[PDB]
Structure 1
Amino acid sequence: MRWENLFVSGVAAWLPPLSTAQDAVMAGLLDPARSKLRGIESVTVASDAEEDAPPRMAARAARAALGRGDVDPADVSLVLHSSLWFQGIDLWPAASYVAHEAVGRHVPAFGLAQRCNGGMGAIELAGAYLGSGIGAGHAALLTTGDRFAGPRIDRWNSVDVTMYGDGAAALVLSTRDGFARVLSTATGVDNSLEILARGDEPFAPHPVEPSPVADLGTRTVRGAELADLPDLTHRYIDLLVAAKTQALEDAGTAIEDIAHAVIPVSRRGTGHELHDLLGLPDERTSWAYGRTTGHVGAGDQYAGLAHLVENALVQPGDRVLLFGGGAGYTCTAAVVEILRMP
């Protein structure tokens, strides 16, 4: 999709303090071989206090993003809140709380689930909503927020390719103006790969209690065994290449003209990484940042973009690729152009 009139108005993260892989190793929580392989130096870890519940961190990130963009909350016509895990209270609309605390009473709010790709997928859904004429305001607030805790989640081991960081991020879209223009978005998807996110886990009538520690790495292997697909790895590669090619093509931009790519925090640690598929070096991705925060739920792309802008690592005229990807498997990519610095 080529967007004629869509902008990023503001972007911000609220992240708790850093917790080092070195301390995790010394506490016996993380095998040193694994620490070295995955290359994550630290992840962000929140206290267990109510004030650090995901919807409260999201509310803080949202207020920072709206303030930095100078967007009036009364001009926000939609709130989308994406997440991976528990928001702190069940049977309750976390999205309406985020909306209420950051924007106000009379804005439609949805919770959005597209696993790790939620932040990026939200941009397409919101962009469409803003162009439709359904609501009066010109802006949409997109938030993410998670806070991982045991027993269910072991942030250091529960996923093979990454380590979870706690925190929230926010991005404000506008059809009027912003510091960056969204030139394009594009989604590659292959829903056959959903089996890798459940493995051989049975469908249970109720959440299994007490919660065993999650092991999504073992799910992918039971999943691969079960699927019996000849081209499993090719399916992943193809959907990622389609998102990239179409986002770039619809933006009229080549990969050589991408100043920086903001990517999911994940790492194989040997062989080809995502940057090799994208066709650009490691230093032109957000990895140097991402490896200090870990995988902050659905917010890596918003957080990484905030990092670029806050540290003046881009200037007007640069184009940036925001690149998604999440279990499903769904990948939404976007090309943005820096128009001015906040």
Structure 2
Amino acid sequence: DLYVAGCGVWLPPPVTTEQALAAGHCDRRLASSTRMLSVAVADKETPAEMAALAAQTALDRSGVAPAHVDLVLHASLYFQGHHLWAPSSYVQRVAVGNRCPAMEVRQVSNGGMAALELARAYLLAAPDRVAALITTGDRMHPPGFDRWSSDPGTVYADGGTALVLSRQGGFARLRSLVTVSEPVLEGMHRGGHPFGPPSPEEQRAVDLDAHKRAYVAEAGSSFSVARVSAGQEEALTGALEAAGAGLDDISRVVLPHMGWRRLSAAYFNKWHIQPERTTWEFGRRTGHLGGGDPIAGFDHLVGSGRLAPGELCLLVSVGAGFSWSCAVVELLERPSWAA
């Protein structure tokens, strides 16, 4: 199989829900239903800057030489700051210093696990390949984005994450990785008829709620909820089965950093697992890093010593489209940078 050789995050200072309420960015009803405590917010740091910083951390920990990094993939879900510019080449220039292929991979909030899929294949496609770097980075600022209200129920963070995947060795083994696609749901996140062509553009601003309501009215709530539930179930069961494990075999579940209401509907009141078995407390203080959530969550569990050698971790990620990815990761040893 493949190994996680390194990982890291770069998170700008948090803004608390209390500060957000006082600043008017946020209403009480939303604070209450999401149960968020705080979210990382950048000042001047741009998406690729934060990704390269996380990447520098992940690479240092991995100890992998630049020449053994055979691919760089940068994932993100929002504007990277400069049109017709190569943010992955920035990540490569600053964090890696080598000349392998560097490109972007996007799959909305599932982008990190999507990049992991392509990185796994790339490493397996040739016998001499060693490692791949995956990064994520996003800066969810005005004018085009409202971290509290553009997609109500999820509060968006600024920051970067990174993971080093390796065929040679590492502190954890990737026991399975399964990705599920249900493209009938793609219209849920755009204008135009759900089952026809998209409408004309909308750069500022992001308003996901209206598009969802329109989708549901056309396809029906029954259809929408059932297709979403089914896709999530396929990813879970596929990943667990591929790893020879059941959900009871899992010590910690890395969930997306969504608000409480969404996490309860999707996971807690569905799978009947307890919050303490998940990254809920970490996520509710961090915010949604898009495709980066499973990397940030795994890094936190490992870094804080909350995952022990021999224990299995389940990564859970979902993106508009829809796409789902689940992965089972086995911790082999506590890395030197952990507690």
Cα distance between partner residues in 2 of 1:267 and 1:28? 19
- Of 278, 285, 291, the match for 1:285: 278
Query: AA paired with 2:235?
Result: A
- Of 146, 158, 167, the match for 1:166: 158
Give the alignment of 1:140-289 within 5 angstroms.
140-200=132-192, 203-204=199-200, 208=202, 212-228=204-220, 230-267=222-259, 269=261, 272-289=265-282
SS of residue paired to 1:89: coil
- Of 46, 62, 69, the match for 1:69: 62
* Residues 124 and 304 (structure 1), Cα distance of their counterparts in 2 relative to 1, 3 Å cut: same
Query: AA paired with 2:152?
Result: D
The answer on 1:32 being equivalent to 2:24 is no
Equivalent pairs counted in the alignment come to 330
* Residues 265 and 295 (structure 1), Cα distance of their counterparts in 2 relative to 1, 3 Å cut: same
- Residue of structure 2 equivalent to 1:46: 42
Cα distance between partner residues in 2 of 1:304 and 1:298? 11
Q: Is contact 2:33-2:153 (8 Å) kept?
A: no
SS of residue paired to 2:59: helix
Q: Is contact 1:260-1:321 (8 Å) kept?
A: yes
Q: Is contact 1:199-1:224 (8 Å) kept?
A: no
Query: AA paired with 1:158?
Result: S
**Alignment identity in percent?**
42
Poorly superposed stretches of 4+, deviation over 6 Å:
none
* Residues 35 and 191 (structure 1), Cα distance of their counterparts in 2 relative to 1, 3 Å cut: same
SS of residue paired to 2:291: coil
The answer on 1:12 being equivalent to 2:12 is no
* Residues 130 and 278 (structure 1), Cα distance of their counterparts in 2 relative to 1, 3 Å cut: farther
The answer on 1:58 being equivalent to 2:58 is no
* Residues 69 and 105 (structure 1), Cα distance of their counterparts in 2 relative to 1, 3 Å cut: closer
Q: What do the CA deviations read for 1:237-257 (whole angstroms, capped 9, x no partner)?
A: 101000000100000011001
The answer on 1:341 being equivalent to 2:331 is no
Structure 1, unpaired ranges of 5+ = none
Q: What do the CA deviations read for 1:61-98 (whole angstroms, capped 9, x no partner)?
A: 00100111111111000011000111111111111111
- Residue of structure 2 equivalent to 1:93: 86
Query: AA paired with 1:306?
Result: D
SS of residue paired to 2:321: coil
Query: AA paired with 1:14?
Result: W
Cα distance between partner residues in 1 of 2:133 and 2:278? 25
Q: Is contact 2:105-2:111 (8 Å) kept?
A: yes
Q: Once superposed, what is the RMSD of the aligned Cα atoms?
A: 1.6
Cα distance between partner residues in 2 of 1:41 and 1:123? 29
Q: Is contact 2:106-2:114 (8 Å) kept?
A: no
Superposition deviation, residue 268 in structure 1: 5.1
SS of residue paired to 2:318: coil
SS of residue paired to 2:261: coil
The TM-score with structure 2 as length reference comes to 0.93
Structure 2, unpaired ranges of 5+ = none
- Residue of structure 1 equivalent to 2:305: 312
* Residues 318 and 289 (structure 1), Cα distance of their counterparts in 2 relative to 1, 3 Å cut: same
The answer on 1:331 being equivalent to 2:321 is no
Q: What do the CA deviations read for 1:214-238 (whole angstroms, capped 9, x no partner)?
A: 2112221112123347421010010
SS of residue paired to 2:135: strand
Q: Is contact 1:18-1:293 (8 Å) kept?
A: yes
Cα distance between partner residues in 2 of 1:258 and 1:304? 15
Superposition deviation, residue 137 in structure 1: 3.6
Cα distance between partner residues in 2 of 1:298 and 1:217? 20
* Residues 124 and 278 (structure 1), Cα distance of their counterparts in 2 relative to 1, 3 Å cut: farther
Q: What do the CA deviations read for 1:174-216 (whole angstroms, capped 9, x no partner)?
A: 0011100000011122101111111448532xx55xx543211
Cα distance between partner residues in 2 of 1:121 and 1:275? 24
